Amino acid sequence: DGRVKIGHYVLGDTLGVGTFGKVKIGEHQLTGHKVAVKILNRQKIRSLDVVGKIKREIQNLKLFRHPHIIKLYQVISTPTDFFMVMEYVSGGELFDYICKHGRVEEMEARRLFQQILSAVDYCHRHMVVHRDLKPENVLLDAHMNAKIADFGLSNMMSDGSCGSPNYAAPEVISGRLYAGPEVDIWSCGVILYALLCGTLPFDDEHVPTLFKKIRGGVFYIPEYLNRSVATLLMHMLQVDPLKRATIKDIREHEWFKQDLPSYLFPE
């Protein structure tokens, strides 16, 4: 041979090095279809005692059907590794696009936020969340569609933006021993803000003062911003998660409902 071939795919460049192993671009030997293969070292899995958990994150992610969540095609099992054959998307990180292009048009921001909000709702409904939404893990494809890695502990990948603690919800910063789905609402509020303004709502070069602005919850609403989406942002970026907007609140908002495609929320 001479090449690392698993199943029908020949592995090539390394897209990133993560927890249980590297992620490499795969290429179907017969069709040429590009693919992203997560390599899960089984000895690493057994050292963390998450064997029964990973096999249920995989078996659960295998039953995921969402156009804006990274799809799992198949899992190939060798005695030493798990090979998760997953969708490859070449558009790069969403926030890398924003930090290089600036704000997008309001219709493009609405289309992308509706895709992201639908994927987040699908994960909260169809899986046991081991991760929270990382806005750095929001990818794009070649058609400018949002692609999200599921919230399982297998997707701890980010190797290979305008800040990093900027996407940390207040209850996460305060070390609250419990956190629910409202943490992802905050992150989506950060995402929506960057889509409409071109920057992050709480950005600060000094990290301690960055945490202070997040706890204060004061962010600059530009006057050019739509007055309706301003109310949505204020509701999503509430410091107190009890007063923070929910998915049903965002789904009912007049700005979110405009030109909403039918396939996103079949519920």
Ligand X SMILES: CCc1ccccc1C(=O)Nc1n[nH]c2c(C)c(F)c(C3C(C#N)=C(C)N(C)C(C)=C3C#N)cc12
3-state class of 83 per DSSP?
strand
Name residues contacting Mg ion, limited to 209-228 (CB under 5 A): 221, 223
The answer to whether 265 is a known ligand-binding residue is no
Exposure string (b/e) for 45-60, b if CB count within 10 Å is 16 or more?
Answer: beeeebeebbeebbee
The entry of Mg ion, ligand X, none that residue 223 binds, CB within 5 to 8 Å by partner kind: Mg ion
What DSSP state is assigned to residue 167?
G
Residues contacting Mg ion: total by CB under 5 A: 2
Q: Please, which residues have CB within 8 angstroms of residue 23's CB and are 6 or more apart in sequence?
A: 14, 15, 16, 17, 36, 37, 38, 39, 157, 159
Backbone angles phi, psi at 76, to 5 degrees: -110, 125
167 near ligand X (CB under 6 A): no
* Chain residues 14-33 in contact with ligand X, contact rule CB under 6 A: 15-16, 23
Q: Which residues sit opposite 11 in a β-bridge? A: 26
User: How far, in Å, CA of 252 to CA of 241, rounded?
Assistant: 18
Helix H or strand E encompassing 6: strand 5-6
**Residue 25 in the binding site for Mg ion (CB under 5 A):** no
Pick the stretch among 120-128, 155-163, 168-176, 189-197 that binds ligand X (CB under 6 A). Answer: 155-163
Instruction: Give the count of residues interacting with ligand X (CB under 6 A).
Output: 21
Q: Sign of torsion, CA 222 228 229 233?
A: positive
- Kindly state whether residue 70 participates in binding ligand X, applying the rule CB under 6 A: yes
Residue keyed to tokens 């602005």: 213
**Is 209 part of any known ligand binding site?**
no
Classify each residue of 9-37 as buried b or exposed e, where b means 16 or more C-beta atoms within 10 Å of its C-beta.
Answer: bbbeeebeebbbbbbbbbbeeeeeeebbb
Q: Is 213 part of any known ligand binding site? A: no
139 binds, among Mg ion, ligand X, none (CB under 5 to 8 A by kind): ligand X
From residue 132, how far is each of 184, 186, 187 by CA, in Å?
A: 6, 11, 9
Residue 100 touching ligand X (CB under 6 A):
no
Q: Which of 121, 132, 150, 184 is catalytic?
A: 132
Closest approach, Cβ 95 to Mg ion, in A, equals: 23
Residue 65 CB, nearest approach to Mg ion (Å): 40
Smaller CB separation from ligand X, 40 or 245: 40
Contact segment (CB under 6 A) with ligand X among 89-97, 120-128, 173-181, 233-241 equals: 89-97
Binds ligand X by CB under 6 A, chosen from 88, 95, 167, 186: 88
Q: Is 249 a catalytic residue?
A: no
Q: Would you count residue 234 as binding Mg ion (CB under 5 A)?
A: no
| Binding of residue 158 to ligand X (CB under 6 A) | yes
Residues 6+ apart with CB under 8 A from 243: none
Catalytic annotation, residues:
132
Binding residues for ligand X (CB under 6 A)? 15-16, 23, 36, 38, 70, 86-90, 92-93, 137, 139, 149, 155, 157-160
Binding residues for Mg ion (CB under 5 A)? 221, 223
